[PDB]
Symmetry: D2
Subunit: 458 residues, 4 copies
């Protein structure tokens, strides 16, 4: 069978292919080849612009334009030609070199310096810079914008549900109340920390020849400061310079990038699970679309499939991201080639994540808080007032406060009247007694609401 979204082995290009279309122009073989062409061309232009390198005179305006067009117009047809050449070379980057030499052959000025294409370069000089550009593009144009959508989305939920009381669950058991909004706020805050970290991750690049010592460069141009030339070229591409490497850029920054993405994903997994649970408890109703089918056999079903889809894909994302993070930075001696094939999977780990981000956003858009249920549940759990009562008792020196409340509530059902009766028998100033009799599980929410309102201050 020919490849199509229906026949694709992986769901990243298959069932969810339309959810990650932007990655097809970045992490695919086409994307890799596109970026390699960009790097090769930029290298030739720097050599030409470098006065000390007389063998490569400055290019005329039209020659520079011809070169820039090769970069900007790079097509699948161009990539297909490179692969055709690769059939002969069985070496992808050499095929890129030969492809570029073919392209400039018709332009005398360029053909003249044809043998300067890839001059003194090793394949990894081209590959690592290509990977850097792929990752930088992915982060700045795709990943961060989804993270911002998720963060803004959670904040909106926090504000929207700021004052909606919730019977908290610790150890899965009824506990001291909070508000739906506050529980949303906690997640936004965590996501924000990771967003800052991802944005601060360095994206490194290098260019220094075969084993990282500019051997070939120096042999031909011993008078040129290639260490300076290297830093200038890498930074000219918008990449941060990595001065010490072997044949390959070590890949530590890729682990740094993926580790933070995995942390964010983990926070999202936690969120997907919690909401799945709130929906199970009926604290949230789900918006329904006319025509849709919840269950093939149970007509009444309305399921949180978006949160579940996201949860599953986040696990897959982390499995791939984690493997790359831990495996890439280890390479035998000056390097073994196992990282090449692995690096063709940078978009895979990212892709599962993007699919999950969209699913979560989709699930969030269908949330309908159920205040009635939330409040009704709280009204059936007056035992949660045992904490404040004992704490107040502690304040006013009443003996064994915690112990007395434990005797009253642990393993015992106690309603409002019962809790109220206990308070009345306490040796406390009327003012405090009345203050205690005035609280309910629904209003025993502490600083929850204000916590939500102050989030914007962090």
């Amino acid at each position: 069978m020919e490849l199509s979204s229906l026949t694709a082995v992986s769901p990243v290009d298959g069932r969810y292919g339309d959810k990650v279309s932007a990655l097809r122009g970045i992490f695919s073989e086409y994307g890799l080849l596109k970026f390699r062409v960009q790097v090769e061309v930029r290298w030739l232009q720097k050599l030409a612009a470098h006065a000390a390198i007389k063998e490569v005179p400055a290019f005329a305006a039209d020659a520079i334009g011809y070169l820039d067009a090769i970069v900007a117009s790079f097509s699948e047809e161009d990539a297909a030609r490179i692969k055709t050449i690769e059939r002969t070379t069985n070496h992808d980057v050499k095929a890129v070199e030969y492809f570029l030499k073919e392209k400039v052959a018709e332009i005398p000025e360029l053909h003249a310096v044809s043998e300067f294409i890839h001059f003194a370069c090793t394949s990894e000089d081209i590959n690592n810079l290509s990977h850097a550009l792929m990752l930088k593009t992915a982060r700045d144009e795709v990943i961060l914008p989804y993270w911002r959508q998720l963060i803004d989305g959670l904040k909106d939920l926090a504000v929207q549900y700021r004052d909606i009381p919730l019977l908290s669950r610790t150890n899965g058991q009824p506990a001291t109340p909070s508000t739906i909004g506050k529980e949303m706020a906690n997640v936004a805050y965590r996501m924000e920390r990771q967003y800052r970290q991802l944005n601060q991750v360095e994206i490194l690049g290098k260019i220094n020849g075969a084993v990282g010592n500019y051997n070939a460069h120096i042999a031909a141009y011993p008078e040129v400061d290639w260490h300076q030339f290297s830093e200038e070229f890498v930074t000219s591409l918008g990449i941060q310079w990595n001065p010490y490497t072997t044949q390959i850029e070590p890949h530590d920054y890729i682990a740094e990038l993926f580790d933070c993405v995995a942390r964010f994903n983990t926070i999202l997994i936690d969120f997907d699970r919690d909401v799945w649970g709130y929906i199970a408890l009926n604290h949230f109703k789900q918006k329904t679309i006319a025509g849709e089918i919840g269950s093939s056999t149970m007509p009444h079903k309305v399921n949180p499939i978006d949160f579940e889809n996201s949860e599953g894909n986040l696990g897959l994302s982390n499995a791939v991201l984690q493997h790359l993070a831990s495996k890439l930075p280890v390479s035998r001696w000056q390097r073994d080639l196992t990282d090449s094939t692995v690096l063709r999977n940078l978009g895979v780990g990212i892709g599962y994540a993007l699919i999950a981000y969209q699913s979560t956003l989709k699930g969030v858009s269908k949330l309908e808080v159920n205040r009635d249920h939330l409040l009704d549940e709280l009204d059936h759990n007056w035992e949660v007032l045992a904490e404040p009562i004992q704490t107040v008792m502690r304040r006013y020196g009443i003996e064994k406060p915690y112990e007395k409340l434990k005797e009253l509530t642990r393993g015992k059902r106690v309603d409002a009247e019962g809790m109220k009766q206990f308070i009345d028998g306490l040796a406390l100033p009327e003012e405090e007694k009345a203050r205690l009799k005035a609280m309910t599980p629904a209003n025993y929410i502490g600083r929850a609401i204000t916590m939500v309102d102050e989030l914007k201050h962090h």
Copy 2:
């Protein structure tokens, strides 16, 4: 950009797409849908053949042929129709049901029992059986055949290199010799163990309604023995029966299946790495063709790129296989849907492995043992004879045998002459002294050759 092998995000469908084409008809959405249709059709066919279920009379030959054709000729166009219907249902299995209902509408016999399609079934009854069929097919038609090629390949190398001496390396250091063939035999033996295990793994399936208690089945047909019905149906598909489940088949067998593939892949990583190193030591030269480029900058390079490609892909395979193996069997209460999207990746872990198997076979085809280097290295490591000498001394009661050889060789360079002189000073019977003076690093290979020759007698 439209999807093509060039724009595909994953190299399983991209760069290596042509290496795993067989999986496109199995693990993809098209494959999933095709098997779902097969299961649905067979379910309807069993209901018809069941005399006690009179509302669905036995189907005549032409109707059975029409149903069989739906299964056999299932096309991408058919899959597209289901996807079109799914746009409305937002439920894939329900779209399959509607698809089939549309298909039988033109056959009165079949159209008359239209509402019996998916009768009493829950989506997972169809899904789990499809996954089982997908995995069984992949194992018997794809995985095992590659494993047999690797095993036979290693065995061929074992025989071909049965008597070629090798300076063994323990802790990376020169050690007691072996033969290239013996080192290959060890790997083939480990591979065979996993082969037998994978083949013995159970591929389970179930069919029992919404939560596993045949609730719906019994509500409509209380006089029918659905437990028996279930076992017959699952086994009729060539799948092994799993009588106890919630809404989903628990997936334990998937972990069992993936755990053995991972063990096999691990053995292969070990192999890829060892050969990469033997090539690094120049114990093997590499066959290459004119035109091929080793390095873009170093024209003299000839690299073991096939073994490296395999090694990298095996790591990826195991990472995906292991995630599925450990995550799938955990599902909240009667099931949470997180396993659905994950199960659409059964072929991904398998795909990375297939790519690796082919790369290794390619690498193996290019190996050329370098007898000259192997022997020359052995002739510069006569210190390895310290072990046999001390051992012989132990036998004949000579004092501090091991200790004496350690003082003589640890941290010291000793050639054939120096080792010979030492043996001469030993208080051993002439015959034993001669035997020791007759051995060399190259012939101090123990039972290596016979071990290789006897491999065929195992497994």
Copy 3:
């Protein structure tokens, strides 16, 4: 600070030390050394009993008893002596050899064949056999017994709760009912599958010299069939023979063993989580004793801390088990020593699991099903009867059955009365209408109870 359970870095030897005491005599350095001594002693004993090896005459009863005593009475003091000798050798197995040599010196018979201790052996010949003995002992005396307790425990719950109705949850939502007992039975069945698998795993061992070719053995005794000698010795230890290896036993069986324990642990995590949730839903209340504190701040709390402790430890167990399973079988060339230090952790992964098994059993002992809540919840979810109604409608040819019930219940609240009214308007034979009007969420449990009663007939 001196080491004590209070200062121990790891909770396996610290807080939970008393929960895994049996492992101290197996996987610790003391245990490793004890088994090494056992293997060394048995090796010497076989050499003596082998008539062809005349330099080591058969041992008389008292000498055999003295050797057996070294093995049987091996103490921490003996272990300390070896560690003392190791301070000089910087090689543990060599220290064991010297230890034994010192021990036999007082027995002329044994002292006379002193240099035959460790004869022709490489350290791994002793190590791998010790690991095999450690794992076999742990499996047969520790792991399986806990697994049997869990399985029997789940089966007891299954029987005890066989007929207690439960509103099932799929996607976390109210679904077709089952029984508490049926949900327990499902787990017991999965556990039994892994139990059989773990019991069937092969525990392999080898003994063949420095690199696996009996080089040293053949150099001294070329007329002896060491391949046969090897198989006899390994099997005499109750271990299964692995004829092909490098310096180390490849460790594939360790992965096979650990892969099944991990699958079992995964099933248990699934269980711990489900029960944690059933407790959260108040389907089960928890037994607690006076004096116990649930929360330091919320006096009303009663938490399922036992299940939570188990769940956390199972994750830890699998993480260690999986690392060993995937890393151990890869060793550079004839072996690199990275597996030695790692193999000192065989008991760690097992320890986390043992802690978890005991915590779960403790949690189970405190469960008290809450029939009132389970039934009350079911009585507020009559919408689950939409499935059986539509299914019956399908049987009797009523049009758009599923679709009609969806419009009636999806996103809508429907009580017993509303469901009853709907059934009355259906064009079905009186008998079928009555049957539908007679069912309730609580009795719509299908074959749940019989499934539980038939569990005993499986496995």
Copy 4:
């Protein structure tokens, strides 16, 4: 059997127990209890020092001293008492509370405010701050110093071997030369990046009650600004404040801490492997100790067991660190208790790492570079000069330079005379021809030496 280093199940407390003794006072149950006592006491002191909280008057000098002594003198006997109390409570932190109440009972001033011990606190307020102190102490006093030793060690090797030529290996094959020192320098640089990152990781702490909303605090003291009180207390402990949490501190920073430690460990694994290989190639000899045994059967053996031990333990370390990093940040709703038992393993992942750090240092101390072998090997690989020759040809416009050199060397043995003969036939200016004939694989090292000398500038 009773617990001893010989009977310990885990080698962290067993065979290598003496290698991690410092962790016994930090991550053990004793350490956890010690820190919990510290937090509880500090909390009581802040309440006393807080003027607005009149029910807890400022403490006299001797009372404060008595409290400080409880913290500073905390012993195993004290910890044993807490565990004895825990037998009754089956709740560790409550046992700590009761233990402290017992300790102050003899001091009237303290006994007077006995019920203010743990006032309004939830166990996790104490636990998370304890974990923060454990991790901060471990990083600043143990981990970073080992990393600094390793970094300084690699730098010393770099300087010591700065000019020692090495036949590089890419794909495991003879490649463009470098120097032993440069290969050491690359590793030091990578380790330094992680050191900076680990040092910059935030160590967070919180204190806000049952579910994070100061519910109990406000119920008793509605006039006190508990949000300010919280930030002050956490920062007073030297911990960074985490304002938004549920019952537990989310643990994201722990993942951040462990992820960077794992990255460092991975770099070290790569190093352990490379040196193991250099030793296998005989580029490094190993120092030998009189009396030691390399092999029980092969008398001549001298093995790099220290690097191997380190490699094995680094893998174990990462397995544990990774599990904690990915599992801890996920907790059901306001929290499930699975993280408590897991957090008792913070020292385990760290312990394996420390054992490995020491083993690597030990292995490094035994390295003896073998210049003779290194140089002899290079002198047998004149084919590596094919790169510079073709590059020079490229510079001077000689047709198909790379192609001509490939024909000459790919799959062919070419010695100095052969390479020299090829150069003589080139149409290049004598000056360049002589420059090429003057190089050897040993001096074709590019900027390697200078790269090493400039490391100190980064």
